[PDB]
Amino acid sequence: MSLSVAEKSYLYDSLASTPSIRPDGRLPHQFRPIEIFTDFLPSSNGSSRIIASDGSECIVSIKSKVVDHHVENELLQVDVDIAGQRDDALVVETITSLLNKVLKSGSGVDSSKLQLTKKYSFKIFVDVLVISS
Amino acid sequence: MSANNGVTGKLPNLIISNVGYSELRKPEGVISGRKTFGDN
Amino acid sequence: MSTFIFPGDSFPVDPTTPVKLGPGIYCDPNTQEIRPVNTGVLHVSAKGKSGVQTAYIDYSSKRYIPSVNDFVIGVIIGTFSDSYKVSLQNFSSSVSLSYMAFPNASKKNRPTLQVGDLVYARVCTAEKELEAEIECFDSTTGRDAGFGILEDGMIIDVNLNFARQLLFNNDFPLLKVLAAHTKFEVAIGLNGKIWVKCEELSNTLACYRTIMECCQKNDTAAFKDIAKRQFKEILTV
Amino acid sequence: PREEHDIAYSKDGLPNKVKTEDIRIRAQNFKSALANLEDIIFEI
Amino acid sequence: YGIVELDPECQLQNLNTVLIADLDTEAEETSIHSTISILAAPSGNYKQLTLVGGGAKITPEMIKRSLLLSRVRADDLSTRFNI
Amino acid sequence: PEIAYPGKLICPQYGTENKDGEDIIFNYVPGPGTKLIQYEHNGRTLEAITATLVGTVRCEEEKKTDTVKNILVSVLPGTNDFANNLPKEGDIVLTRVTRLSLQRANVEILAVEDKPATFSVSQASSDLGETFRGIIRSQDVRSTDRDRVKVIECFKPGDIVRAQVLSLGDGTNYYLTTARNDLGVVFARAANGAGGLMYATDWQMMTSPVTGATEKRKCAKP
Amino acid sequence: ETIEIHPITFPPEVLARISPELSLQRHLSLGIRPCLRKYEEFRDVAIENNTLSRYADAGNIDTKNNILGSNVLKSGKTIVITSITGGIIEETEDIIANYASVYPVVEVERGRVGACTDEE
Amino acid sequence: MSVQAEIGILDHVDGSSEFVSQDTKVICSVTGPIEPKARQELPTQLALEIIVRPAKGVATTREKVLEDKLRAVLTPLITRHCYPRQLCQITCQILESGEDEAEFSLRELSCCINAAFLALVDAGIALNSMCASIPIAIIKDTSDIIVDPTAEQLKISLSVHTLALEFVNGGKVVKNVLLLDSNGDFNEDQLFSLLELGEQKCQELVTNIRRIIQDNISPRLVV
Amino acid sequence: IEIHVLEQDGGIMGSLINGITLALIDAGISMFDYISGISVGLYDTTPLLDTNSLEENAMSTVTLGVVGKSEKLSLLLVEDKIPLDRLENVLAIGIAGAHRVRDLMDEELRKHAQKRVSNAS
Amino acid sequence: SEVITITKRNGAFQNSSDSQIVTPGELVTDDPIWMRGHGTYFLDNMTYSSVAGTVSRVNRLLSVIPLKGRYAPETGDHVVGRIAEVGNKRWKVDIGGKQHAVLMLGSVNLPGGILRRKSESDELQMRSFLKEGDLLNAEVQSLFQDGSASLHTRSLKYGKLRNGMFCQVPSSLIVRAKNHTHNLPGNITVVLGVNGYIWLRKTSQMDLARDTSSWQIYSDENDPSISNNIRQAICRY
Amino acid sequence: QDRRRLLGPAAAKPMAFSNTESEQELSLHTGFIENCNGSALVEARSLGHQTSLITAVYGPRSIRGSFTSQGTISIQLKNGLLEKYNTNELKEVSSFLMGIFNSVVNLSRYPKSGIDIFVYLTYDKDLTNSQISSLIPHCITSITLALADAGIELVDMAGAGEANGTVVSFIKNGEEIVGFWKDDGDDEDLLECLDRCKEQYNRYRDLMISCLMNQ
Amino acid sequence: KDIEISASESKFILEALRQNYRLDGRSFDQFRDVEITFGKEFGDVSVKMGNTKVHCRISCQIAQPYEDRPFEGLFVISTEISPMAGSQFENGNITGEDEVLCSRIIEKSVRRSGALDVEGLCIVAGSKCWAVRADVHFLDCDGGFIDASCIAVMAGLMHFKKPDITVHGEQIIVHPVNEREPVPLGILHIPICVTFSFFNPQDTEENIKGETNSEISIIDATLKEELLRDGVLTVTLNKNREVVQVSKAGGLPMDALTLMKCCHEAYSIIEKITDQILQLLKEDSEKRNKYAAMLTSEN
């Protein structure tokens, strides 16, 4: 966005109130209303569809694959697409590289539940398409 | 032309430089470029 | 058997002569020497011309180099205000033409031409290094409205030396045999452009196909039957 | 951050390292004859 | 290597055709147009030579001079770091 | 306060002397190399003049004529820098001509002078297209006969002009002028490098010695 | 008319940025180089070899390194570092067909972002 | 001298030439002066951009240097001040190898210069002089020197050489050297001998050429 | 015009065009007409309206970009190998499909179009 | 007493006065007497709609009003512009419509008024009075040949905004009336643009002047005295 | 493959091998690159791990885009010789880099002017028999020294200290934090994670100012 | 890089079609005459149709096959435009649209169609196969490139021969060229493409709701002809009367009944030209063998 300077003071004024004030005036800990849909891409292992209040829009797909869990280290892969942008851009790649760290295989991920055999397991694909933000 | 002044009237070598090919034909631009061809 | 030349030959004429430079020769800005820098045949201007002679090389080209007092044919490509965008040859640099350089010169009166028109105009002012300029109406017209916008017609591209012979030369046999069939118009552009309009498109195609073929064959003596045959090729019907 | 050096060879061709002090005096020679001799140019 | 030719105008008191080697310094790399680059192994050997002559002429002797300057600058470096 | 690293906290906003029994207040005024930074320490706030750069402290003053005392704080380098001396409005900048339009003239910024000569050339490489470029519009060449302007009769590509900043303009280029009898063309070679060196015949004209050839340039007053 | 046309002269650092060529011609007048050298004064050359190969320490060659024989080069105002790796393909007097070479990749960090420059 | 050439054999292009020496067929094309791009202009001189297509494969690094040395040679041939803020794209096509592209690039470098020289004559641009290039090799085993070798002789060649010269005064005076591409093993002593035939031969080449140009173009010229 | 291919079922080309014809009307951009698209396949002699990707890899298929109610074409694309003699008949197939396409687009927009003003007003 | 609305619906992509409603490609009629305007194209009789919209028959004029589209600019309208760009002596500024409006250099209220007359140094200060993204009151003057129109501020009442907050809506729901500035209890003021752009701010004295200094027309300042009881009352509206 | 480079014949493969509180330390150097206007050299060596990297400055470069009020920073992380960190792994750090200097640089001193930052992860030993997270704070130090060398208006010698997979960047002699980075570690070890970072920051900034003020 | 033509010239040709004339001298549905000439190398040919000139080259070498089809050899066609052939073009734009419009055709015309047996490139399965290469060069454009490159590639395949092979595990014996002969290649079918060129003399609506079909279609647009055309269509067929590809990718709207009526006329055209290739391949190889008769009797 490109906003105007006279707002930017007032916006920085009102939110830095000591009885702090949002522009929509929520309580300081609130979030905004959303919508959450899933289970709608029946070719997939799982699907997802989420709706923001400003009309920001994404869908994340789940496809799986069986793999040898010894020849491969990363058992869980995230891959992200933002509409309107190049692959090469910054905000793409950082958010992309982030959720890999967020879903490291034994950090908050319980890869034993992913484990198929003593030799095999499940490669998963967190595949992300953001319409708009 | 009357409209302007009628109010006033009633009251180490010898180098000569480059030239275009326009000057290399001798009548020097009286050659009408736009010719229709008349009746025959 | 002609005073044929190469860039890098010995220049023939003595240095102590008052000589108007023609094209094709270049004087050194660094060492003041003067040399032929193009290919072809010199033609020495003969003596008696006020004691001042002139050299010029016949060189062959198709890519037209904009130079002054030269009649060319142009295409309206943009309405940069006060001053037209006009082109003379595809892939070349565009030319600038005043909106006021026109035979009824009137600055409150803005003329009427639109993007994509064909106009007849003469190069007025053009440095080698600057955005070149043309004029339809000129001071060297001497208040002559002889250039101008064209109507529909048809335009054909040739090489430049041919187009000189269309302008500079009466021995050029082309205009004879063409007048010997039908009556029509002709505009000559030193940018290798030849604009023709006839009474008929039928004869214009007959006008078209000859000029493509003749300038290709480039054999002016042969152009008698070659021209007349295309009429029969139109009069095939 | 090795300071650079320059070398030379004599007619033998044996390596002759450049004195650092010379080129400063060269530069002060270079600054000198520049700004002073370029003041007035008396010409035809 | 670089060979240049000289203006009479450009002098400041404290033809003429000078050989320079060990070329650097953008102003040099702009303005030198006849140039020489040589490969050589120290016993008089030559892997390659590279002439782009775009400024001056080239004498037969600036050749030999650069050749004389070739076998020095190489052979020192062969012996400089003794690897 | 003599020598400074960036971040060297120097002095407060205000200071006090007693010059002979009557009380005199200092006003430390932030300049280049400075920034007032508030500092709470153990409860109480404190603004301070901060060294933001590398080199030397310099405290000065001057009052405008055309018991408190203003003191300008000024921070310098000291024993090659041009981001120090970025062009501001009104400056005199030596430039090289890039391209000649019928509209206008385009140059690139190379060297900025200074006030009471002292310069600052840019240390940039133009062959990247790196440097800041500016635009001289053709009616802004001079004010005398500012309408019927013939642009080719004052400039050619690659030439050196003592020109004055008009303003910032866009981010892409600059608004620039030469419209004085002391400003304009500094130096060029003949036929744009194709010949020797050329000298301003008048303030209003330019020739070349060895050639015997002249050209029209809007030369500077020498 | 014989005229003492006074020129305008500058600091030398002004001049080279303006004229690469004439500032050179100033140095040629004294017969020097704008790198402050005389005609044949040549730059020093300084190396260190084998520092970045894993085979630096003959005593304890480390584990995860993959570099065969390394070279540092500084001469003048340009530092260049040469690195050697190797690969293996399954293979199945003085004439050229006896003779092979390596596969190098140069990068010049000349400030410009973007693709592979044509100088490289 | 089994060389032969064609002038003016393309249509929509300013300068065109087919150069055919003994085994290699190469055509060059010249378009200029035309509208330059933004990133390409020079305020003073003429900007040049050169494309060489190989016969085989695509444009890679092996092509790139043969381009770039050919950039160096043309730059003094062109009266570059005559066309400020302009562009002439010149393009060369390798059609026939006549030499092992995996092992050599020698003849093509001789060929393309000899190709592009003539399409400029078709183009009729302000130039400076006359030129020629030949390939020269020295045999490994025989230790002799052949002007214009063949590729099998290249296999037994010890050192491969390309000489480009600048020819004036009826193309007779060596005005300057343009390119000397010394490759392979060589000494001092061979080199002045290595010039000394190509001192003659390139002039002997141009001696043929001076005729050929006028023969092709004086009927294209008018009387 | 932004495309997001989510689930793919074969017939992929004419699938797109029918989505396009919505989207231009979805803002109400100025236009002439409906434009319909459909892949129709050929098992040996027999036309197949509305093939799938299983059938697509099984036989020869043709997609038709059909304009409005007409018999004029926007898109015509054939990858597979086709005997000539069927093709006039093959082309004669898809029009009735294509006319039923822009059929079903229309009312489906219209019942939406009624839903506006009846509850707008 | 919550943070977020999280309500769930899984297993689905989605949850799933009479007048003529016509489609593109559709015939209206072929009575030749009708006139053919917007939303209409034709072939000599065949009246053909081009959008999803309604038949409007005006007395002999038939035209199609769509239902969906961007804001249509019309003259004399009171809207809000966000500053897109700066031109030669021009500015670009979003309407929300198809294109930007334009805004002449002297089209604006000068500080000090008309006693400040023209100056060429003013184009050296375009960025002084205006810069990007800023919001203001603008008065729709007139158009171009396409349908792109321009603006101005011919009052004190028009000018650059402050003292509040922006919001935006679809252009449809804003109803037309003879008035557009409105003052609401809570000491505050809505500035309803027509185009769908909505600015709130605190009621000024000039606002109070409507119903009973001048050098601050490019300021980024507000009234410093802004209570939260102002500020929280903003959010409720 | 790639028609722009020399990558050998395709069927080759590189060579393969198999198995058959501590001190950190610096060596900081400036003024050694003549292309730039700001250069900085960093040696690092710590206990199994030796690291060297180069930070390069180009500024102020012109912006062909449009007007801005102030300056703009551009940061590149590039692999050197041996260690190959992942591509998306790089730019995340580049994102984390820019946030801190946007509380450092007087961009308001530099309208319509660009900042180019080239960081060359040149060579690293890890002889130890979140691998990028161990190299974060040294970058900021390496940038700051080069940015002092171009002499650009910087508020503070800001630095980051490390405590075991955790990176915290300071100002004001540690009295405020400007950049926070955390990986796995413990839980609520933050208070000790204040300390060991702070004292390295207290070490490092003194090492930095020695590198310049003594020159 | 933009071609500029007057709208006056635009109406001119559009009038000529309205009186059934075209500037070249052909009929509407008449094709240019084709000059095919081979170089000395195998897979070397120069192909020329009046003004348009092309040149292509076939080669082959040893590589391994993919994992994808581990049975079969490798083959691909390069069609990199050089701005030599006209100043419109970028230096090797593989991302221009018209390039792709040249590309995907020849991709489908050869590769997905399979005129060439790729399985007959299998020297040894999975170990060593052939990598066959087709570099297309343009020389000078008057259009018909995608028809010219259709021909000149398929011309080149019927003139290339590959050398002799002997297998022993890894001991893969490529023989000398001149002792053991080079061996030509296996062509399943010969495809020939046809450009069709389309001209509305009217507005849009008389094409759209003007029921009267009134649209002129010609063969082999010349350069000036090509710059004003309204739709673009290419079909490809064989001798066995099967249709290889069709591509009308948009442009002008167009009746179906025209297209069949168009494509039948393609058939009689392409067949005669096809056999003209077939004799010249023989006749040159006859001239090769008669000069081989003029060689062994000579030697």
Side-chain angles (χ1 to χ4, degrees), chain A residues 35-42 47-51 57 59, chain I residues 6, chain J residues 9-16:
Chain A
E35 297 174 354
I36 295 169
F37 294 160
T38 62
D39 189 71
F40 70 103
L41 299 174
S47 65
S48 64
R49 189 174 185 270
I50 191 165
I51 297 299
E57 182 181 2
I59 283 169
Chain I
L6 308 179
Chain J
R9 179 72 170 86
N10 294 318
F13 165 74
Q14 62 184 354
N15 287 320
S16 64

Side-chain angles (χ1 to χ4, degrees), chain I residues 50-68 70-78:
Chain I
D50 196 359
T51 62
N52 60 19
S53 67
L54 273 70
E55 289 167 353
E56 278 177 342
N57 295 116
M59 62 187 75
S60 290
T61 58
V62 179
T63 308
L64 296 180
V66 185
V67 179
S70 76
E71 310 302 313
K72 288 180 184 180
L73 289 174
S74 182
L75 185 67
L76 171 58
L77 189 60
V78 173

Side-chain angles (χ1 to χ4, degrees), chain F residues 38-41 43-47:
Chain F
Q38 192 182 10
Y39 282 127
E40 279 181 350
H41 178 66
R44 274 92 55 82
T45 68
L46 180 58
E47 295 175 352

Side-chain angles (χ1 to χ4, degrees), chain F residues 22-57:
Chain F
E22 188 177 3
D23 308 339
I24 291 172
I25 295 171
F26 297 156
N27 190 4
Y28 297 95
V29 179
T34 64
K35 188 173 184 179
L36 279 170
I37 302 173
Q38 192 182 10
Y39 282 127
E40 279 181 350
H41 178 66
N42 297 322
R44 274 92 55 82
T45 68
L46 180 58
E47 295 175 352
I49 293 294
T50 304
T52 75
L53 280 174
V54 176
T56 56
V57 182

Side-chain angles (χ1 to χ4, degrees), chain B residues 12-25 29 31-40, chain C residues 15-23 27 59 68-71 120 164 167-168 179 183-186 188:
Chain B
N13 291 318
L14 286 86
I15 171 168
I16 307 296
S17 296
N18 289 324
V19 77
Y21 292 104
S22 303
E23 296 84 2
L24 300 178
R25 187 58 63 197
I31 309 164
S32 176
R34 186 177 183 182
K35 289 175 283 295
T36 72
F37 285 167
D39 302 335
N40 277 323
Chain C
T16 61
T17 308
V19 168
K20 178 177 285 186
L21 289 171
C27 176
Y59 75 106
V68 293
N69 276 323
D70 293 338
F71 291 163
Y120 192 78
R164 302 170 61 87
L167 180 65
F168 283 166
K183 300 304 168 188
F184 54 90
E185 299 174 350
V186 50
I188 306 171

Side-chain angles (χ1 to χ4, degrees), chain K residues 4 40 53 65 79 85 153 159 169 206 213:
Chain K
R4 65 186 184 272
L53 48 100
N79 276 321
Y85 286 94
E153 289 189 356
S169 181
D206 301 341
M213 186 177 176

